Amino acid sequence: TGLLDGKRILVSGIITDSSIAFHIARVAQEQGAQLVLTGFDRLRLIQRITDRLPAKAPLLELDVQNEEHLASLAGRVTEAIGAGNKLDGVVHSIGFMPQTGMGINPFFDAPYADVSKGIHISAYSYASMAKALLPIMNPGGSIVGMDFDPSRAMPAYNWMTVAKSALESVNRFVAREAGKYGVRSNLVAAGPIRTLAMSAIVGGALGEEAGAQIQLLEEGWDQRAPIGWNMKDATPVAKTVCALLSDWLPATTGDIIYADGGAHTQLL
Ligand SMILES: NC(=O)c1ccc[n+]([C@@H]2O[C@H](COP(=O)([O-])OP(=O)(O)OC[C@H]3O[C@@H](n4cnc5c(N)ncnc54)[C@H](O)[C@@H]3O)[C@@H](O)[C@H]2O)c1
Ligand SMILES: CC1(C)CCC(Cc2cc(O)c(-c3ccccc3)c(=O)[nH]2)CC1
């Protein structure tokens, strides 16, 4: 028997087969969960991607900045799962920052208008999704969001670090709301993952020093992690997410779970 047998789970922000969301999806189904997937904007591409998943599952459209999408969602989900049916889990794997708040671009020259859009999509949306979907969520349910450890600062990550810092604060407040419905809210702080965009950056595309800064990070991370860190293997992150969506961490809300091979616990 699977781990999430007959749980119903919403899963956001799939865009490629290297997206973490995709691997969460994959493992989720492997355990036997019925999924509902949202996508943003290029629904047509995302449709092609989601077809490679163990089982097919409904694709709804959701731009977290679109107010109506948020409004209409609560229903659109219940539609695709059948009325008198509730969700046992939502997964937030959304994030965005303009290239002024990330990469080689100096920290100071990011115009607030840029930064804000970032925080809107990367941290605010977490409460948005939780507001939309809490109503239709079963007791013992789970909310899970994607996070990169922002408690220290580092090169390149710039304003996104702030967005992540924001996000960990939002999460603790959602935890409060979620509690009313008997729902948990947590974040998975993950080590770096070799996604499409990340490898592109390791090839002039975000700069030259940028490629060198990514590489430095990735390598220190593996060296610090007492059980190592394979940037290419996104499975153990997904596995972790699924453990939070399971019934096996029932006493753990408002919190951060570290899938980083233990890096953040080691100085050198
Ligand atoms: N990249 C990493 O190594 C890493 C590490 C830890 C945490 N994270 C976090 O995990 C999440 C996903 O990372 P990823 O590597 O899968 O990147 P990704 O680009 O594959 O996923 C981000 C998703 O957000 C979606 N998105 C963008 N703007 C949106 C909007 N306005 N409304 C709704 N959706 C929108 C995109 O369609 C995309 O599918 C992000 O929250 C990211 O910060 C990433
Ligand atoms: C610190 C460093 C130079 C920059 C990125 C990090 C990890 C990381 C987190 C992160 O949230 C993202 C991200 C940003 C926007 C949209 C989707 C994903 C990322 O690409 N990489 C790995 C290296």
Q: Which structure tokens are listed for 238?
A: 């997904």
Indicate which technique resolved this structure.
X-ray
Chain Cα centroid distance, residue 265: 22
Q: Whose CA is nearest to atom 22 of ligand 2?
A: 192
Nearest CA to 114 among 158, 151, 147? 158
Ligand with smallest separation from the Cα of 63: 1
Percent helix, strand, coil in the chain, to 5, is: 45, 15, 40
- Span from the CA of 75 to the centroid of ligand 1 (angstroms): 24
Q: Whose CA is nearest to atom 7 of ligand 2?
A: 192
Neighbour-count burial for 15-50, b at 16+ CB within 10 Å, e otherwise: bebbbbbbbbbbbbbbbebbbbbbbbeeeeebeebb
List the chain domain ranges.
Answer: 1-268
- Residue 265 backbone dihedrals phi, psi, to 5 degrees: -105, 0
Instruction: Give the dihedral of Cα atoms 239, 244, 247, 250; nearest 10 deg.
Output: 150
Resolution of this deposited model, Å: 3.2
Residue 124 · residue 165 · CB < 8 Å: no
- Span from the CA of 260 to the centroid of ligand 2 (angstroms): 14
Dist CA 56 CA 79 (whole Å): 17
Residue where the block lists tokens 């899938």: 259
Q: Name every protein residue with a CB atom under 6 angstroms from any ligand 2 atom.
A: 95-97, 148, 154, 156-157, 160, 192, 197-198, 213-214, 217
N-to-C CA span, the chain: 41
Residue 12 · residue 93 · CB < 8 Å: yes
Which residues are CB-contacts of 188 (< 8 A; sequence separation ≥ 6)? 144, 145, 146, 147, 237, 240, 241, 244, 256, 257, 258, 259
Q: Is the dihedral of CA 21, 140, 244, 177 positive or negative?
A: positive
Q: What angle do CA 73, 38, 189 make, to 5 degrees?
A: 110
- Span from the CA of 116 to the centroid of ligand 1 (angstroms): 16
Q: What's the CATH fold of domain 1-268?
A: Rossmann fold (3.40.50)
Pocket of ligand 1, candidates 38, 146, 198, 229: which has the most ligand atoms within 8 Å of its Cβ, to mutate? Answer: 146
Q: Is the dihedral of CA 218, 224, 230, 231 positive or negative?
A: negative
* Helical pair 235-245 and 20-31, crossing angle rounded to 10 deg: 60
Ligand 1 contact, 14 CB (< 6 A): yes
What does each C-alpha distance from 71 to 64, 133, 201, 224 come to in angstroms? 10, 10, 36, 44
Residue 263 · residue 191 · CB < 8 Å: yes
Helices (H) and strands (E) counted in the chain, each on its own, are: 9, 7
**Sequence-ordered alpha helix ranges (H) in the chain:** 20-31, 43-49, 67-81, 112-119, 125-133, 158-180, 196-201, 209-224, 235-245
